Design a protein around this nucleic acid. Sequence first.
RNA 1: GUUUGACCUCAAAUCAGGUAGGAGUACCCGCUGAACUUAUAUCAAUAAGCGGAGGAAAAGAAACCAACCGGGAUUGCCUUAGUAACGCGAGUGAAGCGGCAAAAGCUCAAAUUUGAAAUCUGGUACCUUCGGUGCCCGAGUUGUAAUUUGGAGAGGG
RNA 2: GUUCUUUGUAAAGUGCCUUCGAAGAGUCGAGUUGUUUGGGAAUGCAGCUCUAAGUGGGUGGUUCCAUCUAAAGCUAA
RNA 3: AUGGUGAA
Lengths: 156, 235, 240, 159
Amino acid sequence: PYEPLIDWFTRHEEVMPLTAVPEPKRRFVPSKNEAKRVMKIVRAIREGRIIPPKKLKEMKEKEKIENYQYDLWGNDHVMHLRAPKLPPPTNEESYNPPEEYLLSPEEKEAWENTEYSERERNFIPQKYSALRKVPGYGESIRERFERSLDLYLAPR
Amino acid sequence: FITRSQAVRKLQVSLADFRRLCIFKGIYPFYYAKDIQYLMHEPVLAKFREHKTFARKLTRALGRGEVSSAKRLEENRDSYTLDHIIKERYPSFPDAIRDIDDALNMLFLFSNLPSTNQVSSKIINDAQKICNQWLAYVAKERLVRKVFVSIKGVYYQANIKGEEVRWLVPFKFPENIPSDVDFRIMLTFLEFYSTLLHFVLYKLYTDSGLIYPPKLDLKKDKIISGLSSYILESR
Amino acid sequence: NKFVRAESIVAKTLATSREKERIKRVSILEDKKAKNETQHIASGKDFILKITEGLIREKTTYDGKPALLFIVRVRGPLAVNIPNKAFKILSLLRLVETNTGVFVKLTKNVYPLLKVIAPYVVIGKPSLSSIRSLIQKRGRIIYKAEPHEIVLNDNNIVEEQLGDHGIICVEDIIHEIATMGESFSVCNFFLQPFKLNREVSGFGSLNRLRKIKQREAESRTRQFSNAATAPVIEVDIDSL
Amino acid sequence: KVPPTIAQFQYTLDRNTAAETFKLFNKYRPETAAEKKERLTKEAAAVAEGASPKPYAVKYGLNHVVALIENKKAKLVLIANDVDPIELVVFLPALCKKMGVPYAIVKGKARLGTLVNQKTSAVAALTEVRAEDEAALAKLVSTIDANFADKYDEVKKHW
RNA sequence: GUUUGACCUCAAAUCAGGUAGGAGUACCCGCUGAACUUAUAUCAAUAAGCGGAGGAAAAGAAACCAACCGGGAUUGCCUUAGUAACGCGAGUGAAGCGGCAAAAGCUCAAAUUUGAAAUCUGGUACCUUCGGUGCCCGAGUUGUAAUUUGGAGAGGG
RNA sequence: GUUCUUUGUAAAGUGCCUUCGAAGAGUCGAGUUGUUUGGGAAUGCAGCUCUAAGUGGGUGGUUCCAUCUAAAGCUAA
RNA sequence: AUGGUGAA
């Protein structure tokens, strides 16, 4: 019942093809359909119907830059809407404040130990000898992130 | 109210996209059903859907192994615009001027932020350009009134049309970016404030009879690049 | 570990052999040039090539005047293992890590090394504004054992570190680096050169296409001449 | 079990040979609709204001490929192993063997479609190749023959 | 890569563009279908019932009719003819040829465009809107674009 | 009739010379069980065991010849 | 006979 196939017909390769079918000129000649399409596109361009790609690029280069070139003017009064309250002014965080604002080490330790986001101040005022000695402030990013969170997470 | 998950399901939008839309529209919570229903008509939702479709199509093209198709798709794509969303939230220019405090704070903070993986250098460059334009306009109008050097930075106050808006600028020292802050949320605010500041700067320049956007002095840009390098011409 | 196929090994071996031959030829030519036996060589005068955006090629000779140069790692060629000759130079400048960059003083003795490490790095002369921005955006100071590499934060730390040569603030270091100051060598070594962030810094649908486009542009912008007298290629570092 | 003609497929080329064949085929991706359209528009624009050699591309149409075979014009033929109407492809291997045209069976019709900008390509064949890849084409043909006809000489046997 | 994306399949949307129900029913096209009535034959491939469109419907250009000096789509009338044929009783019962009315022939499958899926559905902006152009997306290579149905037909000079 | 457009090495028809030159399968048919006709070759239609070739096959009369090319579809009178 | 109606 189950036997391997036999190559009686496939044993000998076909030296010659099956049908002559003399080759047409189009095989040895550039495509005529492509020429017809090119002529159609030329006619469309001449009739002012298709913008050439170079013209499109030139027009787009001028465009895409006319943004923000029109006056927009020339809202929370609803009872169920409230405006976003702005942060209060500074709290005496001067780089060169009076010595009174320089918190004592014992109270500075308490400020440092206390939790975050429930603190009276986010900084420790310091008495810097010179303006050039003022260091950087890497905590500004965290404060801005917290402000952004509060902006859209405020159950008014 | 309707739970956040319920609102997201009603909007059938991704959580990140939903947060972006909420930030753009200023919605707050557990949200009112009417507000969420109204938000569904915003074109930004359609733009986000188009972006998702484009993303899936581009992934398909790239996986298939046709870089040209993906490049063509990317070139033809266009980004959404916040121009109209600004008007509804700020019907009047004075409201935009009043709210410009947080926009200026964020733009100045991001201008000095070093380039990182989370935020491309293009955004930082745009923020720096916006800050330079604002500083040049303020200096020309001489609207600076209050200066307070502090640990956080220098608290500036520009009396733009007498609104005495207070803004803060951090120092130029390098900043160690913490991992706690999520830049994804901050990027939406950055984009919204960049668009708002662009519109406000154009309006101010038109009011003051100044051509916008002014070019930048190239020779100064190779030496003292910054506020001084941004030359402004009245006409 | 993962199985290693023969194609990668063969490609790496061929690329390493080509790189070794190039390095040997360049070193032999440079040594003969230094000996003044310039009777029979392809070229004697040094050449520096500047490529900028469209692309324009400018060939200029190298003079003995000191100049300021900035070098950034490129992580290339792809299938070329860094040879010992280049490994020593890279270790001396501690630029093994990718995207790392440092400032060096251009001198006649440094030209052969720059030529040797030319394909691996991209060089150029940055402007004062670019140098100031790079210094003020990134920095590192080693602090007390001293296993900490905390970023530069305070001017007083600068006073504590160097102190003697008047380097009391970051602006002093900026001036010393940009200008041909006496402490240029001292400050540069202690500066813990910057670790520039990678270009694309992303992966995904849009990120993959952007990275592919960047890689395609890199080949056109940067080329490996592999010639014995290959001029040093310079690009506009200010753009970066 | 299945008759000898069935199970002839699924005896595809090894990883390296298939990867090399696909790498070679990726150098002759037919121009997509956008590429051809932009080329035609550029030609029209040039003609508006005022000799290329024969283009080279991979022939993949089932009817087109079958026509190419039996005329000895085709040199390499790739056959998908996941054609739902199996009868459309059962005769292809035997016909190629009778005609002597080298042939191979690759995994997945979608893989063939990807290299021809189509969702699914039943077959993919090469007729003419550039002189640069002629040596590469001959080497790939020899490798495919060695790895398929000799390695899987029993593919046409043992049900 | 303990990971992504494709092909194929299966489902959801109060998503966008579409259509069938039913009525009427003299005629038509198919299924189904008895008895009275008369000596398997016969009422009768009828009545009723079921399904499907129209102004007509079906059929229609021979795997035809013929044995002739051959005719040449289908359709309806006369004629063939109450003949052949069947039942050999009762009865049933055609068709070629001939004349008239009207006459139009065509559309696919099957052999490679492969020097260019050149085909088409849908969305969008306009216009001269029973539609046309540009762009976009998708269907298609398991075949949409040229030609051909032996009455031939195709590639070249 | 009046016209505005034509379009492009674009399309079509005839005679001659050369080279090729493809036709529909659970289909015909046989077998068997029911229906139809007044139809003697139940042809025609209906269930099913079986199921073919391409100088082939169907339809007929005479030891050869006569006609056609089924298993696809459209068409007003 | 066909097609339907009702029902200690």
